[PDB]
Amino acid sequence: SVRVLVDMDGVLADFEAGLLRGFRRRFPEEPHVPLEQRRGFLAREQYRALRPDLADKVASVYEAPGFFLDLEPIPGALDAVREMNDLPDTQVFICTSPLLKYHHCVGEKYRWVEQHLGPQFVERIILTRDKTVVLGDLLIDDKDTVRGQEETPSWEHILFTCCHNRHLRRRLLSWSDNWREILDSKR
Amino acid sequence: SVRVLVDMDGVLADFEAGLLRGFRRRFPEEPHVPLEQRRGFLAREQYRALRPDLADKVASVYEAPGFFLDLEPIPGALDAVREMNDLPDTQVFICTSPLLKYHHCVGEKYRWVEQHLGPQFVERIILTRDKTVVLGDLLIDDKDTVRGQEETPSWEHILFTCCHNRHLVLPPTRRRLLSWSDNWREILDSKR
Ligand SMILES: O=c1[nH]c(=O)n([C@H]2C[C@H]3O[C@](c4ccccc4)(P(=O)(O)O)OC[C@H]3O2)cc1/C=C/P(=O)(O)O
Ligand SMILES: O=c1[nH]c(=O)n([C@H]2C[C@H]3O[C@](c4ccccc4)(P(=O)(O)O)OC[C@H]3O2)cc1/C=C/P(=O)(O)O
Ligand SMILES: [Mg+2]
Ligand SMILES: [Mg+2]
Numbered sequence: 001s002v003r004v005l006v007d008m009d010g011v012l013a014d015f016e017a018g019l020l021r022g023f024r025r026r027f028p029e030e031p032h033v034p035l036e037q038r039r040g041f042l043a044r045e046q047y048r049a050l051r052p053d054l055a056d057k058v059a060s061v062y063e064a065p066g067f068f069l070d071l072e073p074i075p076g077a078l079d080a081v082r083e084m085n086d087l088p089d090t091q092v093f094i095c096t097s098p099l100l101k102y103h104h105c106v107g108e109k110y111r112w113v114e115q116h117l118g119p120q121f122v123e124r125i126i127l128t129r130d131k132t133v134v135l136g137d138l139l140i141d142d143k144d145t146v147r148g149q150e151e152t153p154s155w156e157h158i159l160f161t162c163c164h165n166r167h168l169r170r171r172l173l174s175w176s177d178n179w180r181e182i183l184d185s186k187r
Numbered sequence: 188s189v190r191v192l193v194d195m196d197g198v199l200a201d202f203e204a205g206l207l208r209g210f211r212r213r214f215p216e217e218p219h220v221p222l223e224q225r226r227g228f229l230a231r232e233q234y235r236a237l238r239p240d241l242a243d244k245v246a247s248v249y250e251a252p253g254f255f256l257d258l259e260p261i262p263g264a265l266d267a268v269r270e271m272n273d274l275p276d277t278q279v280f281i282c283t284s285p286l287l288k289y290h291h292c293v294g295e296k297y298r299w300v301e302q303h304l305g306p307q308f309v310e311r312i313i314l315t316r317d318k319t320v321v322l323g324d325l326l327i328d329d330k331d332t333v334r335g336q337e338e339t340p341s342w343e344h345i346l347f348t349c350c351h352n353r354h355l356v357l358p359p360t361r362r363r364l365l366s367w368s369d370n371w372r373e374i375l376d377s378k379r
Contacts, residue, residue: 003320003336091336093320098297102309107294110285122289127314133190133280133322135337149190149278150322 001089002186003136005126005155006081008096010142010162013071013112015062019043022061030054038164041143063101068108076175078116085121090183095126095134137186140179144168158182189378190323192282192313192342193268197228197329197349198261199281200299202249205258206230209248217241225351228330250288255295260303263367268304272311277375282313282321324378327364327371331355345374 009015016035023032031054033046040046043062048055061067085092094113099105106127114122126134131141132148139146139155142162146153159171172179196202203222210219218241220233227233230249235242248254272279281300285292293314301309313321318328319335326333326342329349333340346352346363357363364371 093317100306100310102297102301103294106297106314107290110289110293119287123287123316125314125316126320127293127312129310129312130280133313135320135322135341154322 001091002138002183003091003093004084004183005093005095005131005134005136005139005141007139007141007143007160008094008109008112009071010074010164011140011160012074012077012081012094012116013068014074015071016043016163018067018071019058019062022064022067023058026061027057030057035163039167040164043164063099063104065104066108068105069111071112073116074175080175080179081117081121084179084183085124087183089187092121093124093126093134093136094121095128095131095136095139097129097131098127138182140172156186188276188278189325189375190278190280191271191375192280192318192321192323192326192328193271194318194326194328194330194347195281195283195296195299197351198327198347199264199268199303200255200258201261202258203230203350205254206245206249209251209254210245213248214241214244217244222350223353226354228351230351250286250291252291253295255292256298258299261367265303267367267371268308271371271375272308274375276379279308280311280313280321280323281308282315282318282323282326284316284318285314325374343378 016038020032020035031050033050044055044058047058081092084090096109110122110125113125128134130148131139131146132150132153136155138158140158140160142160142165144165146157161171161173203225207222218237220237231242231245234245268279271277283296297309300312315321317335318326318333319337319340323342325345327345327347329347329352331352333344348363348365
């Protein structure tokens with residue numbers, strides 16, 4: 001049995017697009033960072049580099065009520081994870097970290113999964129700031145390094161391609177890339 | 188380095204006392220289950236056996252807004268977990284399962300930890316319905332069996348004593364903590 005841990009932001013839920021849409025909506029005069037020019041996991045820091053006071057403006061977007069609830073799915077993500085979890089001898093958990101400002105993040109993520117994937121996937125959510133203490137064969141995540149208290153995690157990190165990591169170990173280019181072969185490589 | 192997974196309900200947060208106080212307050216006419224007569228971790232099913240309409244009444248108490256937020260800490264728990272996490276070569280995570288009815292559970296548990304233990308322990312919350320896929324040396328929990336997808340969890344399960352599990356008598360091969368004043372330091376030591 002292969003256990004796949006699947007991150008939420010940038011893999012199932014389109015955080016980058018939602019952040020940019022929310023930023024342009026609420027700060028329509030301000031410069032922004034086009035998705036194709038995003039570099040580095042931390043959007044706030046790139047905004048800071050664009051101009052210092054844009055850091056807090058972009059944070060105010062992802063800290064706001066509704067932000068996580070309203071993210072659009074990543075193309076192909078929902079179908080893939082449904083297909084994946086229906087494969088025999090395969091178990092999917094949605095493994096996601098909340099913001100340190102957790103107030104509008106934690107309940108909204110449970111509600112996002114419930115609406116987009118249903119109650120069966122709500123049962124498969126793992127919230128943690130340290131993915132290295134979760135046991136599995138693979139972790140699909142859009143962050144360059146995934147670090148924590150296990151120096152050698154049980155899972156192999158598959159980097160899932162997102163606008164901010166496109167320009168940087170196995171990679172999945174999209175959910176249309178061949179994720180079945182990666183799972184097979186663990187059977 | 189020893190990693191200790193610490194459950195919330197019945198170990199840090201007094202769920203049983205909160206449930207009974209909330210039931211007596213809202214359903215004062217109805218029969219209840221005294222804490223010392225609790226048996227089995229599913230309170231709702233014992234109420235159901237007492238009388239069928241009590242099952243939904245008691246659920247309404249722990250499904251209500253505020254319920255998890257307002258629970259009192261277990262005596263000694265907060266001091267113990269702070270001491271435990273300050274020990275060298277020791278890491279504590281708070282490893283808790285939300286209700287399937289998660290709406291007033293999930294945020295409230297985060298806020299409970301933030302208020303009673305601070306932001307440093309908020310960072311150490313793991314929410315999961317399957318504790319068996321979480322890696323650690325020990326899991327301290329008040330539930331008789333802890334089951335899930337790993338047939339052989341990495342951790343050893345230490346049963347923490349609560350009104351509903353007190354009647355169980357463990358085989359010599361398993362370990363119990365009677366309270367936070369019992370010798371949890373030795374259990375951790377056994378893993379060093
Ligand atoms: O500080 C930040 N700056 C920033 O630009 N972001 C963007 C990037 C993305 O990061 C994450 C994120 C999760 C955990 C820790 C940091 C960031 P994800 O891994 O879920 O994509 O969720 C918050 C999102 O916010 C987050 C954070 C989050 C900080 P933290 O969560 O408090 O550590
Ligand atoms: O059916 C139940 N009946 C019941 O009496 N309870 C009580 C007992 C205890 O159950 C727990 C519980 C949480 C997760 C899985 C089972 C039980 P905990 O052991 O964490 O305290 O959640 C809070 C408490 O609520 C929960 C449930 C939980 C149902 P679900 O599986 O979350 O739908
Ligand atoms: Mg991510
Ligand atoms: Mg418990």
